[PDB]
Design a binder for this molecule. Structure first.
Ligand SMILES: Nc1ncnc2c1ncn2[C@@H]1O[C@H](COP(=O)(O)OP(=O)(O)OP(=O)(O)O)[C@@H](O)[C@H]1O
Ligand SMILES: [Mg+2]
Ligand SMILES: [Mg+2]
Lengths: 80, 132, 52, 208, 357, 101, 49
C-alpha cells in the first residue's frame, strides 16, 4: 500500500486522485465536454505540481520548499 | 578514632618501615600497591579469584620462609605468569634459599597451574623508615 | 498503527532469515526461548565455584 | 562559598560605567581604579542591566517561590501586575474626567506604594523574664521593616482567600486595597504598632 | 517619536478598502460586527485586549492582504479553494483568518466559522451514540454551543434558505421539506439530543444549496489539524476513540473538501491545543500528518511570519496610544530595543511582555 | 575444613543445583508457556516439586569465602565488608584506594 | 532563541551582554550549548557571548 512505501510515488496516489478530481470539476465548470484522464494529467501545470509534492514528501518540508509548492498550486488552479 | 592499618605511636622506640608508617589514606599517594593484576580494572573479570590466590600466596611464603622476610611480598601477574618479589633477611645459609626457591616455585606452579617465579632480594637487616 | 499484509509478511520473512521467533507468541511463551538461550544460574562458574 | 573573600560584588549599572570621568566622585573614582586589580564575582542569572528590572519586585518573587519554582513565581507576579493594570484601566475608562486624573494605572507604582504603606516602624520581640513570655518594643531596621511588609502580604493571600480564587486575583486585590490604606495587611501593621504602645512602659526588659 | 502612531490607525473600517498602503495599520472593527460576525473565534487573550481597550483593532498585514486578494478574485464556478494559514506560534494565524471572516461577512457571504476544532476531540463530558449510524458518537454540548453562534452570525440567511428534504428528528417531530433552515437550527437548540444531528443537516443543506447560486459560503475552520489527528476521548470500554468515529468530526471533514463550488474554504493550523504534537511543530505536514495533508491537497499555504520592522513599530505605538505600556522606561528607545529582543518581534510574546509592563 | 557448618551446607546446595540444573530447566520449560495442555503443565508442576529441595537454586546464599558471613558481602570479590577492608587498607588489593573527593 | 528558550528569564540572560554595551541589534550570534538545564545553558551562553 501507499503507507508501506518509503519514497512517495505521485503516480496512482491520493494526490493524483485529488488533483484529477479538481481538474475534472474545473473543466466541467468551463462547460467543456468531459476530457480524458491522460489529457488533464499531461499538462505542464500538472507536471510542475507533481515535482513540488514529491519534493515535500521525499526531499523534506521547509518554508523554501513550501513556497515552491505555493506557486505550482497557483498555476494549476489558475489563481491570480 | 581510626584503628585500621595504623602502627600507633609508641615513645620513639618502635622501628616502622616505609610501608608500615603510611596509613591507608596514603595508598596511591605516597605508597603503591603490593599486588598488580588486571582483575580490578573496569570491565574485567576474576577479581575474586585473583584476590583469593594472593591471600594464600602471602601465607605460603611466610611459612616457607619463617622469620626470613624483611617486608611484605610484592605480587606481579603478567599474562598467566605470577612473580613473587620478597625482601628476605640474610639469616639462612645460601644453599637453603636455593632449596626453598626450587620447592616453593614447583609447588605453586602445580597448585595454580601457572608459571610461578620467585625473585629474592637479600638485605642485611630490616630497613627502618622512621622511629615512632 | 496496524500492520498491513505487506508489513506482516515482511516481518515473517525477516524473522525467518535472522532466526527469530516467526509466529505470534505471547509474552508467557517467550520465556521458553529465554530459558534455552541463557545459561542457568546454577551452571555459571561463579555459582558452583563460589568457594575455594 | 566558592568565592574567596577577596572577590567583589559586581556592579551592573549601565550608566555608572559610561558617565564622564569628571562626573564621578573621587571616592567612586578610586573604587574603579582599585577594582582593576581585584577579583569580581560573576553576575547572577537574575542580575541584568535591563531597564525593566526592579529589585523590590524581583525580591517579592523569590519570597513567593516554592521549591525553586521561579518560572511559576515569576508568572504569578507577572499575572498580578497585569491583573492590577487591567483593574485600573476599567476604573479609569468608567470614570469622569475629574476622577480620571487621580486614578493611577501604573502597576509598578501601585506595588511600591502599597508595600511602603504596610511597613511597620516599630516591632515586638518576644522575651521571657520571670517565668513568663514578655515581649518588648523594638526599633526595626530598614531590612527588617521591608521584609515584614512583603511577608505579611504573601501570607494574607496564601491563606485567607477562597478555595477557587487564584493568587494573581487575591494579590492584585490586596496591593490595590493596601495602596489605599484600607486592607487587612494595613490592619496587621496597626496591631503591631498598637501592641507596642501598650507595652511602651515595659521596654526596660531588653538585653540585646 | 509618534510618527508610526499615524501609521498605527486607519479610518477604513471596511475590509474591502484595505490595500498595501494600509499595511501595518490598525483598523477598528465596528461594534456591531463584533457581536455578530465574531461571537466566537477570536483568541482568548485578544478578547481580553478588546475588553480593556474598549475597541477591537486588527493590524493590516501582508499575509491577510494576500488572502483577501484571492477571495475577491474567487471563481465561484470552479471548485472551492482551500487556503491554509500555517505559521509559528503566536504569529497571528487566527487573527489573519478572522480578517478574511470580516471581509466575507461584509459582502453578504454565509459564514460557517468553526472557532476551534481541537475542542471537539478532547475534554468531552457527554458522549452519546448516534441513531443515524450506531458506530459514530454524538457530542451534544459541543454541537449545541456552535449552533448558537452559527445562528447569530447567519441569522439573516436563516429565513431565506429552505430545506430541500424531510428530516425526522423524532417519532413525534420532523422537518417538512420547504421549511426555513432556521427551523433545523431551532430544533437543535431546543432538543440537545438532536444537536449533533441538526449540525449535520445544516452542513449538508448549505453545501448542496450553495451550488445553486443563492448565496456564497465561507467554510472557516481554525485548528483544522484536529480533524485528521488523534483524540483523547474513550469509549465505554476505556478504549481511545478515533476522529472519524465522532459525528461532528465526520461531517466537517466533508465541508473542507473541494467537491463543491460557490464558496471558499479558509483553514488554519494551530499546534496550541493539539494532541500528541511537539511544541516546535508548525509546518503543515508535521501537524496535518499524512492523512490530513493528502485530504486537503491541493491547498494554498499562506505563511504567517513575525512582525517586520514596520509592523513592530506600529504595534508598539498602538500600545502606547492606549496608555498600555505604563512603565516609565517603555516609551524610551532602550525600552523599545529591549522589548524587541525579548519578544523577538513575535506578536504574542510582545502582547505578553507588554501586559505585565 | 570449611569455615563453619553453614558454609558446608551451602557448598552442598551449590553442588546439587549444578547436578539438577538441566533437569529443572527442561521440566520448568514445560510450565512457562501457554502452548501445552494444562493437564501436562499441572503434571510437570509436580515433577519439579518432587526433585530434592537442595536442587532449588534460590536456597543458595552468597557468603564471605573466608569468614562465611551471610550479609555484607561484595559479589565482585566474594568477601565481607570487614574482610575486604582489611585487605584494601593494607594495599593488598590491586587498584583499590580510598575515595577522596 | 525565542523557540529554544521559551522562558523569559533565560532570554534576558542572553540580553545582558549586549544591552550592557548598548550593542543590541548590531551582532549576529551562533551558539552551540550542550549539557545542563535551561537556566544553566543560558548562563553558559551569556559568558561565551
Ligand atoms: N493582526 C493582528 N492585529 C492585532 N493583534 C495581533 C495581530 N496578529 C497577532 N496579534 C497579537 O498576537 C496575539 C496572538 O495572535 P493569534 O492568537 O491570532 O496567533 P496564532 O498564530 O493563531 O496563535 P496560536 O499558534 O497560539 O494558535 C494576539 O492575541 C494579538 O495580541
Ligand atoms: Mg491560533
Ligand atoms: Mg537469597
Amino acid at each position: 500500500t501507499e503507507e508501506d512505501m518509503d519514497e512517495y510515488v505521485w503516480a496512482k496516489s491520493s494526490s493524483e486522485n485529488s488533483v484529477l478530481q479538481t481538474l475534472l470539476q474545473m473543466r466541467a465548470a468551463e462547460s467543456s465536454v468531459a476530457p480524458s484522464r491522460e489529457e488533464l494529467l499531461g499538462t505542464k501545470e500538472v507536471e510542475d505540481y507533481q515535482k513540488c509534492v514529491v519534493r515535500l514528501k521525499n526531499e523534506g518540508e521547509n518554508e523554501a520548499s513550501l513556497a515552491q509548492y505555493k506557486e505550482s498550486v497557483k498555476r494549476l488552479l489558475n489563481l491570480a | 578514632k581510626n584503628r585500621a592499618a595504623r602502627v600507633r605511636v609508641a615513645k620513639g622506640n618502635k622501628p616502622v618501615s616505609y610501608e608500615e608508617a603510611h596509613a591507608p589514606h596514603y595508598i596511591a599517594h605516597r605508597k603503591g600497591w603490593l599486588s598488580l593484576h588486571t582483575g580490578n580494572l573496569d570491565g574485567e573479570d576474576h577479581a575474586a579469584e585473583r584476590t583469593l590466590e594472593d591471600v594464600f600466596l602471602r601465607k605460603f611464603m611466610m611459612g616457607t620462609f619463617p622469620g626470613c622476610l624483611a617486608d611484605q611480598i610484592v605480587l606481579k601477574r603478567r599474562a598467566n605468569q605470577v612473580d613473587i618479589c620478597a625482601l628476605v633477611l640474610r639469616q639462612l645459609p645460601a644453599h637453603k634459599f636455593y632449596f626453598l626457591v626450587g620447592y616453593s616455585e614447583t609447588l605453586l606452579s602445580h597448585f595454580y597451574k601457572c608459571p610461578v617465579r620467585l625473585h629474592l632480594q637479600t638485605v642485611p637487616s630490616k630497613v627502618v623508615y622512621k622511629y615512632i | 498503527s496496524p500492520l498491513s499484509e505487506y508489513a506482516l509478511r515482511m516481518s515473517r520473512l525477516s524473522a525467518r532469515i535472522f532466526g527469530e521467533v516467526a509466529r505470534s507468541t505471547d509474552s508467557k511463551s517467550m520465556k521458553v526461548v529465554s530459558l534455552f538461550s541463557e545459561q542457568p544460574l546454577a551452571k555459571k562458574k561463579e555459582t558452583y565455584d563460589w568457594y575455594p | 562559598s566558592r568565592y574567596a573573600p577577596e572577590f567583589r560584588e559586581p556592579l551592573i549599572d549601565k550608566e555608572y560605567y559610561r558617565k564622564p570621568v569628571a562626573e564621578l566622585t573621587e571616592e567612586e573614582k578610586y573604587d574603579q581604579e582599585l577594582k582593576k586589580t581585584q577579583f569580581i564575582k560573576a553576575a547572577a542569572a537574575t542580575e541584568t542591566s535591563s531597564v525593566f528590572a526592579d529589585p523590590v519586585i524581583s525580591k517579592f518573587t523569590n519570597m513567593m517561590m516554592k521549591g525553586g519554582n521561579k518560572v511559576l513565581a515569576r508568572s504569578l507576579m507577572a499575572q498580578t501586575l497585569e491583573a492590577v493594570k487591567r483593574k485600573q484601566f476599567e476604573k479609569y475608562r468608567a470614570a469622569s474626567a475629574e476622577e480620571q486624573a487621580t486614578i493611577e494605572r501604573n502597576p509598578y507604582r501601585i506595588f511600591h506604594e502599597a508595600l511602603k504603606n504596610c511597613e511597620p516602624v516599630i516591632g515586638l520581640v518576644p522575651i521571657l523574664k520571670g517565668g513568663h513570655f514578655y515581649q518588648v518594643p523594638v526599633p526595626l531596621a530598614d531590612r527588617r521593616r521591608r521584609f515584614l511588609a512583603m511577608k505579611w502580604m504573601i501570607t494574607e493571600c496564601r491563606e485567607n482567600k477562597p478555595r477557587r480564587t487564584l493568587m494573581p486575583e487575591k494579590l492584585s486585590h490586596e496591593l490595590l486595597e493596601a495602596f489605599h490604606n484600607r486592607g487587612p495587611v494595613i490592619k496587621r501593621k496597626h496591631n503591631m504598632h498598637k501592641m507596642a504602645e501598650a507595652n511602651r512602659a515595659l521596654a526596660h526588659y531588653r538585653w540585646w | 517619536a509618534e510618527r508610526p502612531r499615524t501609521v498605527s490607525r486607519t479610518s477604513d473600517s471596511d475590509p474591502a478598502k484595505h490595500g498595501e498602503q494600509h499595511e501595518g495599520q490598525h483598523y477598528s472593527i465596528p461594534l456591531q460586527d463584533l457581536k455578530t460576525v465574531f461571537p466566537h473565534g477570536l483568541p482568548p487573550r485578544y478578547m481580553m485586549q478588546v475588553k480593556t481597550f474598549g475597541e477591537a483593532c486588527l493590524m493590516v498585514r501582508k499575509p491577510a492582504l494576500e488572502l483577501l486578494g484571492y477571495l475577491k478574485n474567487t471563481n465561484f464556478a470552479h471548485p472551492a479553494v482551500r487556503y491554509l494559514l500555517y505559521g509559528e506560534k503566536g504569529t497571528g494565524k487566527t487573527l489573519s483568518l478572522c480578517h478574511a471572516v470580516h471581509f466575507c461577512a461584509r459582502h453578504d457571504w454565509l459564514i460557517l466559522h468553526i472557532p476551534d476544532a481541537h475542542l471537539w476531540v478532547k475534554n468531552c463530558r457527554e458522549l452519546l451514540q448516534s441513531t443515524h449510524n450506531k458506530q459514530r458518537f454524538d457530542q451534544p454540548l459541543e454541537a449545541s454551543t456552535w449552533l448558537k453562534n452559527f445562528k447569530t452570525t447567519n441569522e439573516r440567511f436563516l429565513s431565506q434558505i429552505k430545506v430541500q428534504e424531510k428530516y425526522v428528528w423524532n417519532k413525534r417531530e420532523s422537518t417538512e421539506k420547504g421549511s426555513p433552515l432556521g427551523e433545523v437550527v431551532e430544533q437543535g437548540l431546543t432538543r440537545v439530543r438532536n444537536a449533533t444531528d441538526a449540525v449535520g443537516v445544516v452542513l449538508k443543506e448549505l453545501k448542496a444549496q450553495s451550488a445553486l447560486g443563492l448565496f456564497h459560503l465561507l467554510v472557516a475552520v481554525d485548528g483544522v489539524n484536529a480533524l485528521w489527528g488523534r483524540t483523547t476521548l474513550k469509549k465505554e470500554d476505556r478504549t481511545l476513540i478515533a476522529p472519524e468515529e465522532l459525528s461532528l468530526v465526520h461531517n466537517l471533514r466533508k465541508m473542507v473538501k473541494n467537491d463543491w463550488h460557490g464558496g471558499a474554504i479558509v483553514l488554519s493550523l494551530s499546534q496550541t491545543g493539539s494532541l500528541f504534537k511537539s511544541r516546535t511543530a508548525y509546518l503543515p505536514h508535521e501537524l496535518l500528518g499524512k492523512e490530513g495533508f493528502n485530504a486537503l491537497e491541493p491547498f494554498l499555504p499562506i505563511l504567517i511570519p513575525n512582525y517586520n520592522p514596520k509592523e513592530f513599530e506600529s504595534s508598539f505605538q498602538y500600545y502606547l496610544e492606549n496608555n498600555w505600556l505604563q512603565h516609565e522606561k517603555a516609551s524610551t528607545e532602550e525600552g523599545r530595543k529591549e522589548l524587541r529582543f525579548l519578544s523577538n518581534c513575535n506578536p504574542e510574546q510582545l502582547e505578553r511582555l507588554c501586559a505585565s509592563l | 575444613y570449611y569455615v563453619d557448618w553453614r558454609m558446608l551446607r551451602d557448598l552442598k546446595r551449590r553442588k546439587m543445583a549444578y547436578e539438577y540444573a538441566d533437569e529443572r530447566l527442561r521440566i520448568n520449560s514445560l510450565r512457562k508457556n501457554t502452548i501445552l495442555p494444562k493437564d501436562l503443565q499441572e503434571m510437570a508442576g509436580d515433577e519439579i516439586a518432587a526433585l530434592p529441595r537442595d536442587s532449588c537454586p534460590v536456597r543458595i546464599r552468597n557468603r564471605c569465602v573466608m569468614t562465611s558471613r551471610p550479609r555484607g558481602v561484595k559479589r565482585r570479590w566474594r568477601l565481607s565488608r570487614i574482610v575486604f577492608r582489611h585487605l584494601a587498607d593494607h594495599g593488598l588489593l590491586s587498584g583499590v584506594q580510598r575515595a577522596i573527593w | 532563541y525565542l523557540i529554544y528558550f521559551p522562558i523569559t528569564q533565560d532570554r534576558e540572560q542572553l540580553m545582558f551582554p549586549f544591552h550592557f554595551l548598548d550593542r543590541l541589534e548590531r551582532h549576529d550570534v551562533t551558539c552551540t550549548v550542550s549539557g545542563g538545564g535551561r537556566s544553566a545553558q543560558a548562563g553558559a551562553i551569556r559568558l561565551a557571548m
